[PDB]
Amino acid sequence: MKEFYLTVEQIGDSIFERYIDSNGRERTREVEYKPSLFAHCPESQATKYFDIYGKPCTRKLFANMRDASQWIKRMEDIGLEALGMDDFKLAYLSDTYNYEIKYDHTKIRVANFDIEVTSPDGFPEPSQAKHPIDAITHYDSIDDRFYVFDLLNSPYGNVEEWSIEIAAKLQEQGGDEVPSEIIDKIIYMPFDNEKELLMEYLNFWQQKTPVILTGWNVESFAIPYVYNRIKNIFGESTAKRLSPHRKTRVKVIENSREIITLFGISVLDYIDLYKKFSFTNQPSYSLDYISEFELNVGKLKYDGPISKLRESNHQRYISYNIIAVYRVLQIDAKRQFINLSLDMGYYAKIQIQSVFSPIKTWDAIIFNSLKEQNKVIPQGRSHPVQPYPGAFVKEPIPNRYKYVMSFDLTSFYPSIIRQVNISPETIAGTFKVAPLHDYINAVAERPSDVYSCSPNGMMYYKDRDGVVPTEITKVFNQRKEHKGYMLAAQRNGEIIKEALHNPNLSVDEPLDVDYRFDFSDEIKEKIKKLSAKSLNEMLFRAQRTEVAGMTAQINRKLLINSLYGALGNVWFRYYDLRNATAITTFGQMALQWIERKVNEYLNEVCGTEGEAFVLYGDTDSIYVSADKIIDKVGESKFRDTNHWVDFLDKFARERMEPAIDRGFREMCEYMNNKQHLMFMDREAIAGPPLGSKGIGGFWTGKKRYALNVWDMEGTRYAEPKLKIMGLETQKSSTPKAVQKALKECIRRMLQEGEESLQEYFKEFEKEFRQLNYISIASVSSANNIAKYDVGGFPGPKCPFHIRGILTYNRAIKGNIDAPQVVEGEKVYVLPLREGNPFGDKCIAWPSGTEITDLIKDDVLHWMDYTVLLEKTFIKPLEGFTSAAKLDYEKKASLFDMFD
DNA sequence: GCGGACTGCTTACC
Ligand SMILES: Cc1cn([C@H]2C[C@H](O)[C@@H](COP(=O)(O)OP(=O)(O)OP(=O)(O)O)O2)c(=O)[nH]c1=O
Ligand SMILES: [Ca+2]
Ligand SMILES: [Ca+2]
Ligand SMILES: [Ca+2]
Ligand SMILES: [Ca+2]
Ligand SMILES: [Ca+2]
Ligand SMILES: [Ca+2]
Ligand code: NA
Ligand code: NA
Ligand code: NA
Ligand code: NA
Ligand code: NA
Ligand code: NA
């Protein structure tokens, strides 16, 4: 097989690399890499190297990496540019692996681990590491085994061995319900003291050294705690055995927080993977909370506080440690962020941990792309931060909208890049710009007949291929493939959801199919014969396939969009606001241009004139009021809801899209662009159910609307799905129960009507005080707590949630055992009625947790339900209903005087 | 006593 790297590090004049050889074995080699950098030279000096602008350069080979660094500094002192890859690790990887890396994941040691630390005095600071590590579970992906290190003897208690029999038993059975599919993969090891556990762990680590190291919060807790604990006990030299190169780096942040860097290891903390790649914003990021959200597994329920869990129930203590490690594996099997990371990493030829940085990722990609043409990359330069203009957003008239069709452009900014051919080395020149609306209205003089143009004034060559458009097209093509798989899985999902209305009573088995492809007629035929058993399991498998596809497409989308954004970041080698602005300005033109073209087409094809059909639009989308389109054919001529949905689908697909294609084709001509790539396709088909009192949709303002959707990008929903953007139902700061209640109000408004809404509202208002306090608590990040802390009391302009935290601190003040609110993390927030014993109007505590028993009963007693209902529920509901022009409560009328 | 304008903070949409 082709060789491929695992990890790479620069240590002085040496590149330390771990790699899988052509025989499949893991090796490690120390290479004294001789890097090359470049300097401009006279034209007369023949060469094969040129910078991206065509200027010749001479290659400077250095005896070592240190000599190359010094040269860079002297070239700075002289005042001349030093070209080439200054991150020598990237240069090494590029040289060593001059080919598309095909890797074998089964050969990469992926380690998932989690540790337990009993601490009687609050959170055990990893920097201090004063308390014993009394449990470690370490999953090795090559062995496919859970290595469990259990401390039986500790200054905090002596305990019996953990029982795997009991662990496997149902909770109802007194057991721990450690998933049966892993019981056989557990390798259990008890220890009579910590030193022996730790030393044993280090020896295990040496035989099975992680390449990818992950887990939940491993970077901020597990790793630094293990490192410092071992360092405190055995000394630093022993601690450094955690690095296959015996080199670590302690980077410190004073508030004492430490982040350790283990050379030769790529740490991908899963919480960081999840935050960057999941596209969620969660009220809490405890593994308990995320596991529930992702896998629908129950919360690991134990009696008593964690600080006393080991002493009282060591059996469950260890089982929960094992389960916590497995839950991250389960989440990854679903989301597949480790696969994504490996993929990206080997594509760009970077350290795997650098997938968190789109700039490093693209710098490496572009660099490799340019290296192949014997071209030389420019030196990084210093730039001041500058604001610059972005997308256009249409101000919508607040109102209801019965029938709505939406259209969106495909990969807008990356497409704009490819079309215009925007790249650092494809810049041709500039032109005198007319006001933006002159280009939008097609009044302005054609910018150029020789070059490709943006309305920001930039001109680019139409013949020369750009390195940026070239490499952004490659990833875009990947993105497009996976989206195909995603949508197919989605369409298959719906097919199964409908079939679940004819559950055929029988004992059957789930059909063998690749959900990434639209079910064949044969398969669709079979499906209509299965029962809830086989159907529900195919639905699950279809949804897992869809999610896997989502991860792959949405993060390649993120990557390419991040290349756009990078052009607007001063730390990007190819930073250039000429290009970044060329993209955004072109975008503003494109959108408002098609707004006009679409309006023109519809006023004509409908017959009317001067009517505004586009009611809203954001960046690259338009929402077309389709009332007049439906009215033409009249509602009578429709058999059911699905009928007119078919109608609009066909209408948009047959008439509107070709018209839009024509509109953009002309625009591309106007700007003399390299290639027409403005592909606007239909998005949503929304409207109330046929013959109902539902309003279909509504807008309250920019980025705040709801739509009752029947079709989305070709997927016809078995049941109508609510598309809600911006509204309180979508925000993580909104209490769970309020989100749910607000959503039902919206569903009722859009699907059923005013009467139904008032019915539900009256009900919710009556019963809402029985809601669990957590479900009705607000959520918020807690930044700069100390900034507003004046003697434990709110300083000037102290934010509401911060006030709540202070209230909390005072309430628990003194109790070293009470849960502490962490700077930067999130908190639940509740209002307290006047006269409460807390001495303030609100209180806050760490999100995703029950508030400490110390004060729980008092908080429950003094909750201000009235303020809760009015601030979090009624006010937003008032905004929804006012805009749509409805009332959530029956108004008083002249009829109120009749019996 | 408190509404309207401005600010900080937070969390959306693209
Ligand atoms: C979502 C998102 C969009 N944008 C910009 C660039 C996008 O092209 C533009 C529109 O975003 P989107 O229309 O939401 O997504 P997309 O057009 O890039 O690709 P697709 O529609 O097929 O899913 O807004 C960002 O810069 N960053 C982002 O995270
Ligand atoms: Ca011993
Ligand atoms: Ca788009
Ligand atoms: Ca059936
Ligand atoms: Ca054209
Ligand atoms: Ca099309
Ligand atoms: Ca689309
Ligand atoms: Na833990
Ligand atoms: Na159970
Ligand atoms: Na120490
Ligand atoms: Na049937
Ligand atoms: Na006309
Ligand atoms: Na969009």
Give pairs for A446-453: CB < 8 Å, separation 24+: A446/A670, A446/A672, A447/A671, A447/A672, A448/A672, A449/A672, A450/A672, A451/A672, A452/A419, A452/A420, A452/A421, A452/A428, A452/A671, A452/A672, A452/A673, A452/A674, A453/A420, A453/A671, A453/A672, A453/A673
Q: State which fold the A772-863 domain adopts.
A: Ribonuclease H-like motif (3.40.1820)
Query: What CATH number should be reported for the domain whose range is A727-771+864-885?
Result: 1.20.1280.300
Specify the resolution in Å. Answer: 2.2
Task: For residue A113, report the phi and psi dihedrals to the nearest 5 degrees.
Answer: -145, 165
Alpha carbon distance A145, A143 (integer Å): 5
**Interior/surface letters A405-436, b for 16+ CB within 10 angstroms, e for the rest:** bbbbbbbbbbbbbbbbbbbbbbbbeebebeeb
A723 CB below 7 A from strand B atoms: no
Nearest nucleotide by C1' position to the A730 CA atom: B12
CA A418 to chain centre: 25
Alpha carbon distance A559, A551 (integer Å): 12
**DSSP-assigned letters across all residues of A113-164:** EEEEE--SSSS--TTT--S-EEEEEEEETTTTEEEEEEE-EETTEE-PPP-H
**DSSP-assigned letters across all residues of A166-198:** HHHS-GGGTS----HHHHTTEEEEEESSHHHHH
Task: For residue A556, report the phi and psi dihedrals to the nearest 5 degrees.
Answer: -75, -35
Torsion of CA A471, A472, A475, A479, to 10 degrees: -170
Task: For residue A300, report the phi and psi dihedrals to the nearest 5 degrees.
Answer: -60, 95
Alpha carbon distance A416, A434 (integer Å): 20
Q: What is the CA angle A510-A511-A514, rounded to 5? A: 120
Torsion of CA A520, A523, A525, A530, to 10 degrees: -150
Nearest alpha carbon to residue A33 among A94, A99, A101, A98: A94
Positions of E strands within A54-122: 57-61, 110-117
Nearest nucleotide by C1' position to the A802 CA atom: B9
Alpha carbon distance A349, A343 (integer Å): 10
Alpha carbon distance A717, A444 (integer Å): 45
**Interior/surface letters A205-229, b for 16+ CB within 10 angstroms, e for the rest:** beebbbbbbbbbbbbbbbbbbbbbb
Alpha carbon distance A131, A122 (integer Å): 11
DSSP letter assigned to residue A592? H
Q: Which two three-digit tokens encode residue A401?
A: 């909208």
Angle of helix A532-566 versus helix A467-499 axis, rounded to 10? 160
Encoded amino acid at A492, one letter: N
Helices (H), A278-408: 287-295, 309-312, 314-335, 337-348, 358-371
Alpha carbon distance A711, A685 (integer Å): 5
Beta-carbon contacts of residue A881 (< 8 Å; ≥ 6 apart)? A749, A757, A887, A888
Q: Which two three-digit tokens encode residue A638?
A: 């429709």
Beta-carbon contacts of residue A94 (< 8 Å; ≥ 6 apart)? A85, A349, A364, A367, A368, A371
Alpha carbon distance A218, A178 (integer Å): 22
Q: Is A63 exposed, middle or buried (0-12, 13-18, 19+ CB in 10 A)?
A: exposed
A777 close to A829: Cβ distance less than 8 angstroms: yes
Alpha carbon distance A643, A649 (integer Å): 10
A391 close to A588: Cβ distance less than 8 angstroms: yes
A453 close to A671: Cβ distance less than 8 angstroms: yes
Q: Which two three-digit tokens encode residue A632?
A: 């033409």
Q: Which two three-digit tokens encode residue A4?
A: 């491929």
CATH 1.10.260.30, applies to A1-108+337-379? no
Distances (CA, A) of A149 to A157, A202, A413: 16, 11, 51
Please state which architecture CATH assigns to domain A380-465+570-726: Alpha-Beta Complex (3.90)
A509 close to A535: Cβ distance less than 8 angstroms: no
Residue with tokens 């699907």: A751
A262 close to A224: Cβ distance less than 8 angstroms: no
Which ligand is closest in space to the CA of residue A172? 9
Nearest alpha carbon to residue A435 among A281, A585, A540, A214: A585
Per DSSP, the three-state class of A810 is helix
Residue A474, by phi and psi: left (phi above 0), alpha (psi -120 to 50) or beta?
alpha
Per DSSP, the three-state class of A333 is helix
Query: Measuring from atom 9 of ligand 1, which residue has the nearest CA?
Result: A412
A24 close to A107: Cβ distance less than 8 angstroms: yes
Query: Measuring from atom 2 of ligand 1, which residue has the nearest CA?
Result: A561
A872 close to A778: Cβ distance less than 8 angstroms: yes
A801 CB below 7 A from strand B atoms: yes
Query: Measuring from atom 6 of ligand 1, which residue has the nearest CA?
Result: A413
Please state which architecture CATH assigns to domain A109-336: 2-Layer Sandwich (3.30)
Termini Cα distance of chain A: 88
A702 CB below 7 A from strand B atoms: no
Alpha carbon distance A747, A743 (integer Å): 6
Question: Which of A476, A620, A623 to mutate to test ligand 1, by most ligand atoms within 8 A of the CB atom?
Answer: A620
A632 CB below 7 A from strand B atoms: no
A592 close to A392: Cβ distance less than 8 angstroms: yes
Alpha carbon distance A386, A478 (integer Å): 33
Question: Which of A279, A410, A412, A618 to mutate to test ligand 1, by most ligand atoms within 8 A of the CB atom?
Answer: A412
Question: Which of A278, A413, A550 to mutate to test ligand 1, by most ligand atoms within 8 A of the CB atom?
Answer: A413
* Partners of A543 in beta bridges: none
A797 CB below 7 A from strand B atoms: yes
Alpha carbon distance A635, A651 (integer Å): 15
Neighbours of A60 (CB within 10 A): 17
A427 close to A53: Cβ distance less than 8 angstroms: no
Q: Do β-strands A715-725 and A778-781 pair in parallel, antiparallel, or remain unpaired?
A: unpaired
**A174 CA from centroid of ligand 7 (Å):** 52
Q: Which two three-digit tokens encode residue A385?
A: 């931060």
Alpha carbon distance A742, A174 (integer Å): 40
A249 close to A263: Cβ distance less than 8 angstroms: yes
Residue A303, by phi and psi: left (phi above 0), alpha (psi -120 to 50) or beta?
beta
Residue with tokens 């789930």: A510
Task: For residue A727, report the phi and psi dihedrals to the nearest 5 degrees.
Answer: -60, 160
DSSP letter assigned to residue A373? T
| Ligand 1 pocket, Cβ-based, cut-off 6 angstroms | A 408-413, 557, 561, 564-565, 619-620
A558 CB below 7 A from strand B atoms: no
Q: Do β-strands A375-376 and A50-51 pair in parallel, antiparallel, or remain unpaired?
A: parallel
Surrounding ion ligand 6 within 5 Å at CB are A 657, 681
Q: Which two three-digit tokens encode residue A387?
A: 């604001």
Q: Is the dihedral of CA A562, A565, A571, A573 positive or negative?
A: positive
Angle of helix A314-335 versus helix A287-295 axis, rounded to 10? 50
**A174 CA from centroid of ligand 8 (Å):** 22
**DSSP-assigned letters across all residues of A244-272:** TTS-EEEEEE---EEEEEETT-EE--HHH
Q: Which residue is nearest to nucleotide B12 (CA to C1')?
A: A726
DSSP letter assigned to residue A395? -
A473 close to A674: Cβ distance less than 8 angstroms: no
Separation of A285 CA and B9 C1' (Å): 21
Query: What CATH number should be reported for the domain whose range is A466-569?
Result: 1.10.287.690
Q: Do β-strands A145-151 and A186-191 pair in parallel, antiparallel, or remain unpaired?
A: parallel
Alpha carbon distance A86, A36 (integer Å): 9
Task: For residue A14, report the phi and psi dihedrals to the nearest 5 degrees.
Answer: -115, 140
**A5 CA from centroid of ligand 1 (Å):** 33
Q: Which residue is nearest to nucleotide B7 (CA to C1')?
A: A797
Angle of helix A337-348 versus helix A358-371 axis, rounded to 10? 40
| Sequence ranges of the domains in chain A | 1-108+337-379, 109-336, 380-465+570-726, 466-569, 727-771+864-885, 772-863
Nucleotides in B strand less than 7 A from protein CB = 8-14
Q: Which two three-digit tokens encode residue A123?
A: 């959170």
Alpha carbon distance A806, A844 (integer Å): 8
Q: Which two three-digit tokens encode residue A342?
A: 């490996």
Question: Which of A279, A475, A561 to mutate to test ligand 1, by most ligand atoms within 8 A of the CB atom?
Answer: A561
Q: Which residue is nearest to nucleotide B13 (CA to C1')?
A: A703
Q: Per residue, what are the HEC states of A829-867? A: EEEECCCCCCCCCEEEEECCCCCCCCCHHHHHHHECHHH
Q: Which two three-digit tokens encode residue A460?
A: 């680019």
A801 close to A827: Cβ distance less than 8 angstroms: yes
A705 close to A658: Cβ distance less than 8 angstroms: no
* Partners of A154 in beta bridges: A157
Separation of A385 CA and B6 C1' (Å): 25
A374 CB below 7 A from strand B atoms: no
Distances (CA, A) of A169 to A148, A179, A815: 18, 9, 37
Q: Which two three-digit tokens encode residue A109?
A: 């040691």
Nearest alpha carbon to residue A367 among A110, A38, A829: A38
Q: Do β-strands A57-61 and A36-40 pair in parallel, antiparallel, or remain unpaired?
A: antiparallel
**A301 CA from centroid of ligand 2 (Å):** 33
Alpha carbon distance A235, A252 (integer Å): 19
**A679 CA from centroid of ligand 7 (Å):** 8
Nearest nucleotide by C1' position to the A702 CA atom: B13
- Asked if the domains at A1-108+337-379 and A380-465+570-726 fall in one CATH topology, the answer is no
Per DSSP, the three-state class of A475 is helix
Q: Do β-strands A110-117 and A212-214 pair in parallel, antiparallel, or remain unpaired?
A: parallel
